[PDB]
Design a protein around this ligand. Structure first.
Ligand SMILES: [Mg+2]
Ligand SMILES: [Mg+2]
Ligand SMILES: [Mg+2]
Ligand SMILES: [Mg+2]
Ligand SMILES: [Mg+2]
Ligand SMILES: [Mg+2]
Ligand SMILES: [Mg+2]
Ligand SMILES: [Mg+2]
Ligand SMILES: [Mg+2]
Ligand SMILES: [Mg+2]
Ligand SMILES: [Mg+2]
Ligand SMILES: [Mg+2]
Ligand SMILES: [Mg+2]
Ligand SMILES: [Mg+2]
Ligand SMILES: [Mg+2]
Ligand SMILES: [Mg+2]
Ligand SMILES: [Mg+2]
Ligand SMILES: [Mg+2]
Ligand SMILES: [Mg+2]
Ligand SMILES: [Mg+2]
Ligand SMILES: [Mg+2]
Ligand SMILES: [Mg+2]
Ligand SMILES: [Mg+2]
Ligand SMILES: [Mg+2]
Ligand SMILES: [Mg+2]
Ligand SMILES: [Mg+2]
Ligand SMILES: [Mg+2]
Ligand SMILES: [Mg+2]
Ligand SMILES: [Mg+2]
Ligand SMILES: [Mg+2]
Ligand SMILES: [Mg+2]
Ligand SMILES: [Mg+2]
Ligand SMILES: [Mg+2]
Ligand SMILES: [Mg+2]
Ligand SMILES: [Mg+2]
Ligand SMILES: [Mg+2]
Ligand SMILES: [Mg+2]
Ligand SMILES: [Mg+2]
Ligand SMILES: [Mg+2]
Ligand SMILES: [Mg+2]
Ligand SMILES: [Mg+2]
Ligand SMILES: [Mg+2]
Ligand SMILES: [Mg+2]
Ligand SMILES: [Mg+2]
Ligand SMILES: [Mg+2]
Ligand SMILES: [Mg+2]
Ligand SMILES: [Mg+2]
Ligand SMILES: [Mg+2]
Ligand SMILES: [Mg+2]
Ligand SMILES: [Mg+2]
Ligand SMILES: [Mg+2]
Ligand SMILES: [Mg+2]
Ligand SMILES: [Mg+2]
Ligand SMILES: [Mg+2]
Ligand SMILES: [Mg+2]
Ligand SMILES: [Mg+2]
Ligand SMILES: [Mg+2]
Lengths: 259, 134, 158
RNA sequence: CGCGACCUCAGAUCAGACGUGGCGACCCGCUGAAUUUAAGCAUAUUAGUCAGCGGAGGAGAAGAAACUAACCAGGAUUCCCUCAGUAACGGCGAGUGAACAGGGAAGAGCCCAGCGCCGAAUCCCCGCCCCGCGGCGGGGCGCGGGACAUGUGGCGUACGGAAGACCCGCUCCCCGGCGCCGCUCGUGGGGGGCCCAAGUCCUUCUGAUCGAGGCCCAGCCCGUGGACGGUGUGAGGCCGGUAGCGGCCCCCGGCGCGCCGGGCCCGGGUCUUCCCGGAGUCGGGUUGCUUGGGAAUGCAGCCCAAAGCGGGUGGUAAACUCCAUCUAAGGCUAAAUACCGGCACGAGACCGAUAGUCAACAAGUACCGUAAGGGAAAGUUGAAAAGAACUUUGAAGAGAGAGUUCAAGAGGGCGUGAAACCGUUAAGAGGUAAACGGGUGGGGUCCGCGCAGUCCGCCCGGAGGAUUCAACCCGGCGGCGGGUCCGGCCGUGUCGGCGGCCCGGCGGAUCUUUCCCGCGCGGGGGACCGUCCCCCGACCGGCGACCGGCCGCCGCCGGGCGCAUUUCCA
RNA sequence: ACCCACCCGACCCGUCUUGAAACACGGACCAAGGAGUCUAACACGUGCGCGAGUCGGGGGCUCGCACGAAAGCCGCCGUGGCGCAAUGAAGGUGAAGGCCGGCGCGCUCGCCGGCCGAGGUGGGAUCCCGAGGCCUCUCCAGUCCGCCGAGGGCGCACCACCGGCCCGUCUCGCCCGCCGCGCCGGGGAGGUGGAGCACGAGCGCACGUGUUAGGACCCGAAAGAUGGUGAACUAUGCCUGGGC
RNA sequence: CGAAAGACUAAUCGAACCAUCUAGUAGCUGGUUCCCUCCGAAGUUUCCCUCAGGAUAGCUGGCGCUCUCGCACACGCAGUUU
RNA sequence: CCCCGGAGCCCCGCGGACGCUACGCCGCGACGAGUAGGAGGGCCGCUGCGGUGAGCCUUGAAGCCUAGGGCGCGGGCCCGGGUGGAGCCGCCGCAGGUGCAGAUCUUGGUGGUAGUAGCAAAUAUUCAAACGAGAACUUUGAAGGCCGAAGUGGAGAAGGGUU
RNA sequence: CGACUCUUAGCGGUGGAUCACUCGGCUCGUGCGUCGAUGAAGAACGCAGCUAGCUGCGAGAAUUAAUGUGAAUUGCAGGACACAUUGAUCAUCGACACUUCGAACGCACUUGCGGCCCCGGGUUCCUCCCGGGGCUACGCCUGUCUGAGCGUCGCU
């Protein structure tokens, strides 16, 4: 809000003794705006309490490994059909979930090709659902150039644009990434972890060179490896009804002694 | 999307641009499609509508297959008046009802020299793009 | 008033500081502008290194830095004299010259002569006209590179 | 008593030039508070900050060491990060508070006076010609004026310079024009103009659609275009645009080639002989301000007032002494840097008409004040004005009918139309002001019923009626699970191959310069170690990591089974 | 839940106050507006990443930014910050001890070889060992599985105590060292000051609370300062007119 | 400016008016916006140009941690008494 | 002295809820005043952003109103009907100029007071007519009155600015 | 029942909250970075067929020319134009024009007084008179012309 906002008046308080109320009141004149109420956050005209400043700490800076950890986490759950389906993406009829494709797809220079591809791969019904979501936004962002809203679609990770990013462009829903420049804002939109992507074999090879396997450095991010796991056996149902453990448990007291 | 970083995509800016548009610019805004018949012949989608073209109204109340001659172009009001597109006021007097140019179709153009040269310029650019696409 | 334990601390917000707050919303826009301007300057100085001129090796001052070595401002006159480059010319071939540098020890001098010698070896002086006189190199070492050198020219590695 | 030089001074509506005011976001020079903090206050602080005056530019200022340092030393200025809330200052309280180094952004360096040499070799203005002329210039020609020796120009300035002799190697740089060629990064520089994809297809809602299903061919078309706006609701395809190393036309810039006109005989090293520095300034004393600068950081006034192996600095006063380091008292200089004013654009997790600027509107308007100055309120009929013809009552405003509109339960301050408050209509009550909490009753308003609500669901027994089964085999498909791990793919731990090791790469302060290349160092090999991969065998976790057969079980389809069965229905 | 009736109950809220129904203030009524914010610095708590490190800025390389003024990467990855060491005003100094054997006279002092290597007491969650049961449809043999377990151990963290080491300081003492034998340098014993060491816990990011500096929860002075406008009223002087 | 009343100086005078410094400062008045749940004070200490305020103890809450054993197998602590 | 793909089960160690959003579900005891103040939970509420609901919406969004039906301890919420006429919400995250009865609060509006106070300075009006929808007030005529030439008369100055 | 009063609801008023819109703001960024005696900013007064305000312009006054565009402008009139023609209307803007105050310039601020050169009526240069035109600020520099001085000399 502007600096001068509210203070461009010259207004003194009629002190006590005049009845009225000790506010600074507009000085002199034969207008409506005379002996009014200036400056106070409560007055009409007035001046907002704690006017907003530009030097509010807008930007927010995050540790680099943590950023990478998130981006690994999103990738890891771009596998897992459950996490992709739960994130909404109609991935029912898709052939294999870390969906990787031939690298002619770098070639394509026309939406025609890019859509045909998506229909063969059965990824179109996500795009279809994007069209279905296209609707008007609720409220004031309508009058501030955020008027329409819709779904996020299939990600498409490419290794090099040989034409591709032109091809997939008008197809609403699609975002294109380079592998070498991935982004958590796009791999986990809403801060929500799953997301159906579509890999290019050239790009899908490059992932291990970028992120490093568990027994090999990144070899592309100088000093980095994957984050180690805290617990390895995630399925505790496989643990808890093992021989080794159930051997060593007292028998479950389960009678219900009511009052 | 639009990628040109000197265009606007800003409701307030586009509307202000529109409503406070100058006559010669309004000419372009007030354009209207050719009939499929002419679309075939001239290789042109649409043309800036003019004082005495022949025209169908396509949508609204006056939507109909009659071919009325244009009567005048009220560029201030973003509208054109058409021959029998009119309504009787309280006291019997006919009043030319406005139709917006874009909800109308030009069946017959009023061809002058300049209109002829315009159509030659638009058709040529269309065929350049088809040659570039091929 | 202070309450039970804490740094008895002095902030410097008693002047009208909000009148002189300097935001950094530029900086991205700035960073680009420099970068464009940088790429333009390269393109202007066509086969010449983007870097600038070549600069001497030089030790830092003080006990602290002492052990490290930087690029200096420009080669001394003795170093040009010994290498055998006329000081007025050295500017014209992309050799930084300062003339305010003393030269105390002969270990720093011979190193910096060696630098210039090496430079003169791996330099490709184009002739003034396309018709080729003396000094100007062969059209072989010219066609094979009218290439710019990315980064600092012959970088110093401590 | 003249005439003539010059000197110092006047006057011209003398000829020709410039300066004056504005703006002021940023910038330079002065000037300079007090609220305030210190829980009082006077030093301090607020603050070299507001107000005041001056002067600028697209930036300004600064800037090519009288610098840092004390190192094995750095090397103009500006800017950022850091130094650092540190050294220091301070009623050592409140509080205040730099610099060097280091890493970056940028990067560019120069010229006089003097000292000297050169016939003033220089400059300005006249006037005549040729070119050029919307940033008054080139070339030529004039016994045409003047400036200038009280010093103009070339060489030259501390990084040394000049003049000499011989060592060497050889000779393009600039401008005034006139042309002409390649339109020269947002991927054709800048500006202007004019252009360029695809449905108003079906049906159906609607006052109007832009909405909803649909559109065999793989999916209506186009899609480098599904930004945005407009158009009687919500529009990739109606229109303007949007995309595109898309088009054409203008103009202008910038750089490439040719010709002419001029200028321009412009080096380097080596040895010798010469040459060399800014005074009422430095410095001191002082008083006042200023600084973190403390026995004086910087600026001032006044007084004193210099030197030349001098002078200045070397963060505690002085003397002696060595070292180090610059060279002051003359000047110019792009760049990274700043920008709440201007012109022109772009955007927003902002505001949405008591908000957001004072100001969405005929706002710095109306209005007030002698004046300096103060300073509002105020957006919205409808898709379209189709803004109510006509009849009638009234002097008229106002009505009553009629009409327009999807609607006037939208009628020109008219979208929606809350509350306070008022009018009426209906219902109920009424001498302790009203109103309230708890508890019942009565009446109303609607709401759910029921014209039996006897509510359903299993299973069973009987009684009626109707289709094909189930049970079973047979053929097919699919699924599960299993062990023989049977056969093969798959991968964990271990051992064997030293096998990838050079046909496996990186890393290493491990080594070797027996190596190679480039100049004791750099790069590359070559050993070595660490790490990552092939070959087969063996043991073991046989792991949701899979295949193939076999087994068992399940399910579906079709075959079989026509009826004491298996269904449906009452 | 609308109205009415009746019995019982029942003073008007806000606020300052020991005390408010108060003869204490504010309040006719309704609508909209309206006050603990943001920045910086500190501290503690909590969450995440990495961990004797950590770090990201600032800068740079990748784009015309549609989304991007993002995202990514950097021998800059670390100049540098904080951290990994203190203590002294400073010159400076700077965290090890034990044991064993030998040689100097073991002199609770000086020098040479070997071994262990962050001391010890008490309490300590927890682990570990475990006599012994306690049965099995018989009399004994007898491996397997538990359940308990008297008794005994290693003892985390943490606490209390005693030792030890480093810096400052004092007191007392006796020896070593060498290019410079000196107003040189080095050690020992015993106290005592230190925001110390005694097998590390930090760094960055985020949220919360608190405390400050800022307009700093919102409203409120009397005043103070700078620069400007007024003698059309009125005060006094003067000029020129009028009136009694 | 005053034949003096601190009179008058544009309805303003024991220091005019206008704009700014200025959102001047306030240990003092006033106000300070939704629900349920759980815990729940103090007006006493010492210091203060302190007495209508701070500081510091105290009294409150929150976060915990370390242990204890009703899992036939307990140590320590108290607004008592012996 | 035999096997649960069958002991038939009050216990079943072969496999295991109707139950198991393990931030879930269930059982036993105990307890419950509260200013200032503190903390927790709010499927309480407001506005905007990333996600997400193949959400809703001209076959009627928001708002508004309702002696209609309900839920919740409560903040609040949901449905019916009316009105309205174009947008709007649920969930998971993030963000804040986020919730009013008070401030002699600010801006706007409205009451009671109230058809009340009040329309009393300076002696004065009456008759007829005209116009006119309409006359206490205009105009004309007639009468009765006042200002009483230091004027309620006739002309300027200043000031106004078309009166 | 009566009037009045209170309560609730219906409908109507008053009033303009709410909601929905937004050619306006606020903030951040980019590029450029240009006023003036050749008369600036600012002020004044003018100018439309009917026009008061806002805007736009300057006695050529809601504009002239030019270039681009290519049929309007429109509240009503009137008109033009041949929109197969420099051609309506917009845009651009390079030519032209630009009343009075204002640094503000003949001197004054009445809008008053002038001087000096030339031109037309007036004369027949007769000066008057009238009208038109061009000059007439201060400071300062380079030159130019006229000079001043018991300033310093020389010759006579
Ligand atoms: Mg405001
Ligand atoms: Mg809303
Ligand atoms: Mg550089
Ligand atoms: Mg000026
Ligand atoms: Mg004070
Ligand atoms: Mg105080
Ligand atoms: Mg005081
Ligand atoms: Mg100061
Ligand atoms: Mg100032
Ligand atoms: Mg400058
Ligand atoms: Mg200098
Ligand atoms: Mg420096
Ligand atoms: Mg620090
Ligand atoms: Mg200071
Ligand atoms: Mg000279
Ligand atoms: Mg559209
Ligand atoms: Mg639309
Ligand atoms: Mg189109
Ligand atoms: Mg000072
Ligand atoms: Mg000293
Ligand atoms: Mg300078
Ligand atoms: Mg308004
Ligand atoms: Mg309003
Ligand atoms: Mg407003
Ligand atoms: Mg409104
Ligand atoms: Mg309205
Ligand atoms: Mg409204
Ligand atoms: Mg309606
Ligand atoms: Mg309506
Ligand atoms: Mg209305
Ligand atoms: Mg509306
Ligand atoms: Mg009644
Ligand atoms: Mg009190
Ligand atoms: Mg009392
Ligand atoms: Mg009370
Ligand atoms: Mg009483
Ligand atoms: Mg009081
Ligand atoms: Mg009251
Ligand atoms: Mg409110
Ligand atoms: Mg912490
Ligand atoms: Mg604290
Ligand atoms: Mg605060
Ligand atoms: Mg105040
Ligand atoms: Mg004072
Ligand atoms: Mg005073
Ligand atoms: Mg305040
Ligand atoms: Mg007090
Ligand atoms: Mg508690
Ligand atoms: Mg309670
Ligand atoms: Mg409370
Ligand atoms: Mg509408
Ligand atoms: Mg906000
Ligand atoms: Mg209220
Ligand atoms: Mg009365
Ligand atoms: Mg008269
Ligand atoms: Mg009513
Ligand atoms: Mg209003």
């Amino acid at each position: 809000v502007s600096e001068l906002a509210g203070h461009q008046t010259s207004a003194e308080s009629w002190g006590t003794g005049r009845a009225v109320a000790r506010i600074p009141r507009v000085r002199g004149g034969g207008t409506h705006r005379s002996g009014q109420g200036a400056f106070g956050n409560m007055c009409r005209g007035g001046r907002m309490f704690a006017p907003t400043k530009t030097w509010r700490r807008w930007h927010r800076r995050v540790n680099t490994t943590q950023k990478r950890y998130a981006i690994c986490s999103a990738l890891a759950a771009s596998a897992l059909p459950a996490l992709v389906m739960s994130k909404g993406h109609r991935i029912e009829e898709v052939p294999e979930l870390p969906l990787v494709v031939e690298d002619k797809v770098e070639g394509y220079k026309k939406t025609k090709e890019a859509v045909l591809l998506l229909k063969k791969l059965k990824a179109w019904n996500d795009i279809k659902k994007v069209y279905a979501s296209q609707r008007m936004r609720a409220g004031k962002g309508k009058m501030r150039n955020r008027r329409r809203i819709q779904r996020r679609g299939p990600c498409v990770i490419y290794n090099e644009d040989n034409g591709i990013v032109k091809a997939f462009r008008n197809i609403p829903g699609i975002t294109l990434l380079n592998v070498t420049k991935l982004n958590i804002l796009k791999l986990a939109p809403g801060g929500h972890v799953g997301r159906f992507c579509i890999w290019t074999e050239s790009a899908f090879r490059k992932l291990d060179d970028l992120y490093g396997t568990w027994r090999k450095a990144a070899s592309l991010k100088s000093n980095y490896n994957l984050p180690m796991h805290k617990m390895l056996n995630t399925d505790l149902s496989r643990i808890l009804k093992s021989p080794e453990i159930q051997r060593a448990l007292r028998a479950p007291r389960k009678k219900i002694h009511r009052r | 999307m639009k990628f040109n970083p000197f265009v606007t995509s800003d409701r307030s800016k586009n509307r202000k641009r529109h409503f406070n548009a100058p006559s010669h610019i309004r000419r372009k805004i007030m354009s209207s499609p050719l009939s499929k018949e002419l679309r075939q012949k001239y290789n042109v989608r649409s043309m800036p509508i003019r004082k005495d073209d022949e025209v169908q109204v396509v949508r609204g109340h006056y939507k109909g297959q009659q071919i009325g001659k244009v009567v005048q172009v009220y560029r201030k009001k973003y509208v054109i008046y058409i021959e029998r597109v009119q309504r009787e006021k309280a006291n019997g007097t006919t009043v030319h009802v406005g139709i917006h140019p874009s909800k109308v179709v030009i069946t017959r153009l009023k061809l002058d020299k300049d209109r002829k040269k315009i159509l030659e310029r638009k058709a040529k650019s269309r065929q350049v793009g088809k040659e570039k696409g091929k | 008033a202070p309450s039970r334990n804490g740094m008895i601390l002095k902030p410097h917000f008693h002047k009208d500081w909000q009148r002189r707050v300097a935001t950094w919303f530029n900086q991205p826009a700035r960073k680009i502008r420099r970068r464009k301007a940088r790429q333009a300057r390269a393109r202007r100085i066509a086969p010449r290194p983007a870097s600038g001129p070549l600069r001497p090796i030089v030790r830092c001052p003080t006990v602290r830095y002492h052990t490290k070595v930087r690029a200096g401002r420009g080669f001394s006159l003795e170093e040009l004299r010994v290498a055998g480059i006329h000081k007025k010319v050295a500017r014209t071939i992309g050799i930084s010259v300062d003339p305010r540098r003393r030269n105390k020890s002969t270990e720093s001098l011979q190193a910096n002569v060696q630098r210039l010698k090496e430079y003169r070896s791996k330099l490709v002086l184009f002739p003034r006209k396309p018709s080729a006189p003396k000094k100007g190199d062969s059209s072989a070492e010219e066609l094979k590179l009218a290439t710019q050198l990315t980064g600092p020219v012959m970088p110093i590695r401590n």
